[PDB]
Amino acid sequence: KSRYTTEFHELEKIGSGEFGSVFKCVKRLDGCIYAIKRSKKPLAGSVDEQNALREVYAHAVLGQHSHVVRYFSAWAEDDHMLIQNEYCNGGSLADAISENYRIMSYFKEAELKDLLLQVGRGLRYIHSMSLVHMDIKPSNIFISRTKVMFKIGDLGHVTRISSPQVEEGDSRFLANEVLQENYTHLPKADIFALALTVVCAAGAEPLPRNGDQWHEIRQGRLPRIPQVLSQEFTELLKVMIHPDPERRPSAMALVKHSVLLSASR
Ligand SMILES: CN1CCC(n2cc(-c3cc4c5c(cnc4[nH]3)C(=O)N(c3c(Cl)cccc3Cl)CN5C)cn2)CC1
Ligand SMILES: [Cl-]
Ligand SMILES: [Cl-]
Ligand SMILES: [Cl-]
Ligand SMILES: [Cl-]
Numbered sequence: 001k002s003r004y005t006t007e008f009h010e011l012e013k014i015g016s017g018e019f020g021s022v023f024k025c026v027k028r029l030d031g032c033i034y035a036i037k038r039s040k041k042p043l044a045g046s047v048d049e050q051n052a053l054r055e056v057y058a059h060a061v062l063g064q065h066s067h068v069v070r071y072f073s074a075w076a077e078d079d080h081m082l083i084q085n086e087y088c089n090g091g092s093l094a095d096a097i098s099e100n101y102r103i104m105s106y107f108k109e110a111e112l113k114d115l116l117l118q119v120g121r122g123l124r125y126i127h128s129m130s131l132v133h134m135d136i137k138p139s140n141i142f143i144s145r146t147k148v149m150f151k152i153g154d155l156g157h158v159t160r161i162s163s164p165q166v167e168e169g170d171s172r173f174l175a176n177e178v179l180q181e182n183y184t185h186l187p188k189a190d191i192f193a194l195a196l197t198v199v200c201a202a203g204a205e206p207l208p209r210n211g212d213q214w215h216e217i218r219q220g221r222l223p224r225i226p227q228v229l230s231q232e233f234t235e236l237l238k239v240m241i242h243p244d245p246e247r248r249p250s251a252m253a254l255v256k257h258s259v260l261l262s263a264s265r
């Protein structure tokens with residue numbers, strides 16, 4: 001007799017976290033298919049509650065954009081918090097990249113430009129709302145197939161653009177200035193992470209979490225990419241990982257970039 005059990009039928013598990021999981025569900029009254037994340041509810045009044053509530057608010061304010069997974073509802077039950085989103089039938093970008101890796105057939109240049117432009121429009125929107133994402137990576141981006149659409153789905157590190165305290169995102173995608181607790185240019189940390197996300201989609205080996213190879217990238221050196229890309233596209237990716245955040249393009253500049261003009265729909 002919970003809301004989750006009475007209003008939805010679970011179809012298939014489609015994601016899994018430490019404190020719960022995501023199911024593809026059909027909603028009984030409207031007949032439509034949704035993705036629903038169900039997680040342990042944090043303590044009332046706790047810091048974890050504040051964090052969980054911020055993530056709900058980020059879905060509720062960002063999900064109407066075409067390149068953010070759409071939000072429908074969120075609720076609490078006795079021991080759980082639930083978020084109901086659109087179901088993206090193509091799954092995560094990380095799983096698409098994993099399959100591509102296995103078969104040796106990666107995203108081609110035109111498809112990489114589409115990914116970069118589409119997630120770039122998502123970031124231009126997020127930044128225009130005075131927010132930053134803080135955890136761009138393949139496992140946080142979802143695919144809808146019909147032309148392909150990429151959508152930012154996980155919003156659990158979103159915070160305001162001038163936040164003086166930040167929960168760092170995945171260390172594989174994290175820009176050095178954030179690691180050093182410099183938060184003057186937070187939008188450019190999302191640009192850095194998006195470039196490395198595109199490098200992953202271009203066929204690169206798994207990125208380092210730490211160590212010498214991690215530091216090499218933070219000097220502005222792109223990882224090896226196993227396919228020929230144009231020099232100007234490669235140069236765009238490199239300047240998006242520039243050690244000086246101010247040299248990286250804004251998301252607005254990225255979506256207006258001459259290199260991505262061909263990708264525009
Ligand atoms: C052939 N094959 C069949 C199965 C297909 N498949 C689709 C998915 C899938 C997961 C998922 C989602 C979401 C949205 N659409 C999704 N689609 C989504 O909104 N999620 C979410 C939610 Cl519900 C609340 C808060 C944050 C987030 Cl990130 C995360 N999960 C895991 C997995 N496999 C892939 C093709
Ligand atoms: Cl409902
Ligand atoms: Cl799963
Ligand atoms: Cl939408
Ligand atoms: Cl419950």
Ligand SMILES: [Cl-]
Nearest residue numbers: 088089090091
């Ligand atoms: Cl499907």
Ligand SMILES: [Cl-]
Nearest residue numbers: 120121124255
């Ligand atoms: Cl735009």
Ligand SMILES: [Cl-]
Nearest residue numbers: 094137138139
């Ligand atoms: Cl990932």
Ligand SMILES: [Cl-]
Nearest residue numbers: 094137139170
């Ligand atoms: Cl991950």
Ligand SMILES: [Cl-]
Nearest residue numbers: 176177180182
């Ligand atoms: Cl710094």
Ligand SMILES: [Cl-]
Nearest residue numbers: 185186187188
């Ligand atoms: Cl900035």
Ligand SMILES: [Cl-]
Nearest residue numbers: 172200206207
């Ligand atoms: Cl990786």
Ligand SMILES: [Cl-]
Nearest residue numbers: 220221222238
């Ligand atoms: Cl380089």
Ligand SMILES: [Cl-]
Nearest residue numbers: 230231232233
């Ligand atoms: Cl060129």
Ligand code: NA
Nearest residue numbers: 063065068070
């Ligand atoms: Na949306």
